[PDB]
Curated annotation (Swiss-Prot):
InterPro entries: Globin, Globin-like_sf, Myoglobin. Residues 1-147 form the Globin domain. Keywords: Cytoplasm, Heme, Iron, Metal-binding, Muscle protein, Oxidoreductase, Oxygen transport, Phosphoprotein, Transport. This is Myoglobin. Pfam families: Globin (PF00042). It comes from the Eukaryota. It is found in: Cytoplasm, Sarcoplasm. One of its GO terms (biological process) is removal of superoxide radicals. The lineage of its organism: Eukaryota, Metazoa, Chordata, Craniata, Vertebrata.
Length: 153
């Protein structure tokens, strides 16, 4: 798990996201969709977005970004004690949305990228380490639920 010090770093970094949840959420999803176009195809409601300009102009994309980061933030504030929060998300993403764990790896990487892009020189090595551990814990606990369900893709 994460140490008390590491969780403090995670939640400090998270304050940066909370100052502009929609902007961070939008950029995370755009990074995901442009880097990995197959991910867009999982969103029937974003399939029409044929260019990054269209993505940037989509108010619904920003809305979904807010929903995604709000859910993740709730999970992070549990400092690993997130079974009740995480289980339903893992199950909706496997059974309803059909999201392979690879795509969760992609979005985790996108979050790290966006933090550096929006806060260059202000996302230190310690902070990156801690946030990476938190995202890996999130992904890994989802992976355990995916295995329970026998879900791959
Ligand atoms: C940080 C990781 C993620 C979080 C916290 C998250 C959170 C959420 C939440 C809260 C919802 C709405 C409730 C629900 O259906 O369970 C949702 C819906 C959805 N998610 Fe995610 N999600 C994540 C990653 C992903 C990824 C990587 C994909 C696909 C590449 C994805 C695909 C979807 C889709 C297709 C929906 C339904 C969207 C709609 O049509 O309204 N999610 N997600
Ligand atoms: O999502």
């Amino acid at each position: 798990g994460l140490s008390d010090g590491e969780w403090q770093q995670v939640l400090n970094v998270w304050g940066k996201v909370e100052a502009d949840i929609a902007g961070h959420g939008q950029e995370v999803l755009i990074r995901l969709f442009t880097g990995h176009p197959e991910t867009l195809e999982k969103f029937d409601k974003f399939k029409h977005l044929k260019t990054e300009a269209e993505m940037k102009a989509s108010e619904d994309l920003k809305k979904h970004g807010t929903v995604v980061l709000t859910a993740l933030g709730g999970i992070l504030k549990k400092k690993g004690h997130h079974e009740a929060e995480l289980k339903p998300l893992a199950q909706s993403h496997a059974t309803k949305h059909k999201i392979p764990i690879k795509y969760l790896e992609f979005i985790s990487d996108a979050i790290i990228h966006v933090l550096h892009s929006k806060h260059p020189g202000d996302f230190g090595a310690d902070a990156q380490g801690a946030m990476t551990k938190a995202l890996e814990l999130f992904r890994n606990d989802i992976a355990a639920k995916y295995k329970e369900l026998g879900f791959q893709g």
